[PDB]
Design a protein that fits this description.
homodimer; about 120 residues; mainly alpha; Serine Threonine Protein Phosphatase 5, Tetratricopeptide repeat; about 0% strand; globular; Ankyrin repeat domain-containing protein 2A (chains A, B); protein transport; AKR2A; ankyrin repeat domain; cytosolic targeting factor
Chain lengths: ~120, ~120
């Protein structure tokens, strides 16, 4: 998917182009991943902002019920976590193993992301 | 702390006893939490009323700069949010991640608390 490809590579202009030509912002991979999942996991803030502006679901879940916030948390993408937080992402959402994004942060040793979410997440 | 313990468990009579024997209503934990933080987070309205009556700071901030209203909001304790509101709690107060209690409500999917604060919070 070209929307997934450009978002994954941080190709903002390409992503903007794909969405312009009618690319589907919430199109999902075979694993249930959306372009916002990749942008947030790879730390592509600009692309994530584009997707969010275009209307992409900030709380989209993949086949493991992981949201873009799980992706940013587990890969330690602090700027992306912050973006998700100011666009009302659900921080208490659990994946299939009953883990919230702050849990995934901890498990992946992303302690700076844990320190941020500790301020906002009430579990 | 016995004032924290009783408040946390909803032990009104015990809390009243602790404050009677000179327990410190605004004593804080190692995390900067007061007994009112626990009462509000656990939804212990009676205990919260006791603390407030005894003079406890309705706007006390913990180490993450979260107030009792952040605690009631994030855990969806509507009755406690209402109590805080009629005792002049500051609804625009931001924590260390620049989030007000209505922001924390939203992030924690406490939509009924969001609907209440929408009526009073001007941001």
């Amino acid at each position: 998917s070209i929307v997934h490809q450009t978002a994954s590579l941080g190709d903002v202009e390409g992503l903007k182009a794909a969405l312009a030509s009618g690319g589907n912002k919430d199109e999902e991979d075979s694993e249930g991943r959306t372009a916002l999942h990749f942008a947030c996991g790879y730390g592509e803030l600009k692309c994530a902002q584009v997707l969010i502006d275009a209307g992409a679901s900030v709380n989209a879940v993949d086949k493991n019920k992981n949201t873009p916030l799980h992706y940013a948390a587990g890969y330690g993408r602090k700027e992306c976590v912050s973006l998700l937080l100011e666009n009302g992402a659900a921080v208490t959402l659990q994946n299939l193993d009953e883990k919230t994004p702050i849990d995934v942060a901890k498990l992946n040793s992303q302690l700076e992301v844990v320190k941020l979410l500790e301020k906002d997440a009430f579990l």
